[PDB]
Amino acid sequence: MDRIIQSPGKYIQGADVINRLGEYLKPLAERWLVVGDKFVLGFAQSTVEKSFKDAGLVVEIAPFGGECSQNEIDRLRGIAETAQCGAILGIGGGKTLDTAKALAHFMGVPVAIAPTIASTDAPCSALSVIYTDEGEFDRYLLLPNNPNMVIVDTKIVAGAPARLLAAGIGDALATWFEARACSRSGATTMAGGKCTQAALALAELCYNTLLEEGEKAMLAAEQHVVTPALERVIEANTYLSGVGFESGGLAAAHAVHNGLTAIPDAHHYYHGEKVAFGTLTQLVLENAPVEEIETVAALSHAVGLPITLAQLDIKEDVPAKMRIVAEAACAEGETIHNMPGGATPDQVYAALLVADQYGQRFLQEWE
């Protein structure tokens, strides 16, 4: 069929770049509503308003309620209309950015996304994961276009807990392996077409960047300072992993992540930490070479990601729980079917237990 690649129109990243929000956003619109994370605004609202004023723009700073509900979308739209805003800027965590994207869609205005943590691949994407109130996956919610601009302040991001950066590494570690399987299987990407050569290049660039700079970036994040290794990992976590998964395809890792949410044991863990184990489960499922799985297992453990089920607090009734996880992964419309050859709930259940047994041996041999 057709080959399609989607991208945000502009990706900018740099230290203290929120000082330049005004100059970068001015071409898009003149009247902006800012849906700001309460924590981000507590320490930076002054400089955001100054950045806009110095560029001759008008702002309506709107503290984000916290949840990405339709109530909150409606409330924010009223503010935006009363102020006659022509574009939305979301700045903060994922729930903040997902709201800004939904708002600007309903208002048919351009959107700017400014993540303040590099913990998932969601920002650049034209997507949204819809979740039941029990913490279990439901559906992917698509949007007609990607954000117009993504702006990443690497100094703000370096301030977050390093666990968040590692969770982004976990979500990005999957990119190459799931896009590669979609290429092998002739699967359709979330952009609606076959793989381009470009998307597969970025997905493989993502994986290699994490291998070469993951541990060094983790060192800078713990000190909350910016080094070039950190910059590269933030780009891998945001642009590369975003364009890679959307335009290269999802497969077993994210299906296993959605399957893990169907049990409450790992509810208190981040997206990327569950994806980290889904990658390892995909490598067993597709019988990756022993050298490949050892590398992925070693980098994952080197940044604190879980490589066994106990590290996601799954410790009792493991078999019963893994049947639920496996059936959930194989549900209708799930991405596990993009695996070369496909996968059966008996097959995913096997890989779960075997990935776990492999992770346990690696932690033993590391001592």
Positions in 116-145 near a copy of itself (CB under 8 A) = 144-145
Contact residue for a copy of itself among 32, 239, 270, 362 (CB under 8 A) = 239
Q: Would you list the DSSP string of 46-103?
A: HHHHHHHHHTT-EEEEEE--SS--HHHHHHHHHHHHHTT-SEEEEEESHHHHHHHHHH
Catalytic (active site) residue 271: yes
Catalytic (active site) residue 267: no
171 is a contact residue toward Zn ion (CB under 5 A): yes
With tokens 């509503």, the residue in question is: 33
- Would you state the torsion angle of the CA atoms of residues 318, 324, 325, 327, taken in this order, to the nearest 10 degrees? 140
- Which span (151-159, 166-174, 225-233, 314-322) binds Zn ion, by CB under 5 A? 166-174
Kindly give the pairing relationship between strand 137-140 and strand 129-131.
Answer: antiparallel
Q: How far is the CB of 275 from Zn ion (least distance, A)?
A: 5
> Which of 171, 301, 337, 356 is an active site residue?
171
Catalytic (active site) residue 317: no
Closest CA to 237 of 170, 178, 292, 306: 170
Q: How far is the CB of 86 from a copy of itself (least distance, A)?
A: 10
Q: How far is the CB of 115 from a copy of itself (least distance, A)?
A: 15
> Helix 252-260 to helix 271-285 angle, to the nearest 10 degrees?
130
> By C-beta, is 289 or 333 nearer to a copy of itself?
289
Site for a copy of itself in 145-174 (CB under 8 A): 145-146, 148, 155
User: How many residues make contact with a copy of itself (CB under 8 A)?
Assistant: 75
Site track 4-23 with a copy of itself (rule: CB under 8 A), x = hit = xxxxxxxxxxxx-x--x---
What are the beta bridge partners of residue 153?
14
334 is a contact residue toward Zn ion (CB under 5 A): no
228 binds, among a copy of itself, Zn ion, none (CB under 5 to 8 A by kind): a copy of itself
261 is a contact residue toward a copy of itself (CB under 8 A): no
Contact residue for a copy of itself among 18, 21, 28, 276 (CB under 8 A) = 28
Closest CA to 87 of 158, 151, 153, 159: 151
Contacts of 141 (CB under 8 A, 6+ apart): 127, 128, 129, 130
> Which of 254, 265, 337, 356 is an active site residue?
254
Contacts of 317 (CB under 8 A, 6+ apart): none
10 Å CB burial of residue 346 (0-12, 13-18, 19+) is exposed
Spacing of C-alpha 177 from chain mean position = 15
235 binds, among a copy of itself, Zn ion, none (CB under 5 to 8 A by kind): a copy of itself
- Would you state the torsion angle of the CA atoms of residues 66, 67, 73, 79, taken in this order, to the nearest 10 degrees? -10
> By C-beta, is 28 or 40 nearer to a copy of itself?
28
Site track 285-314 with a copy of itself (rule: CB under 8 A), x = hit = xxx-xx------------------------
> By C-beta, is 76 or 253 nearer to Zn ion?
253
17 binds, among Zn ion, a copy of itself, none (CB under 5 to 8 A by kind): a copy of itself
Distance CA 93, CA 117 (A): 6
Site for Zn ion in 26-45 (CB under 5 A): none
Catalytic (active site) residue 356: no
Amino acid at 201: A
> By C-beta, is 171 or 213 nearer to Zn ion?
171
Catalytic residues: 171, 254, 257, 271
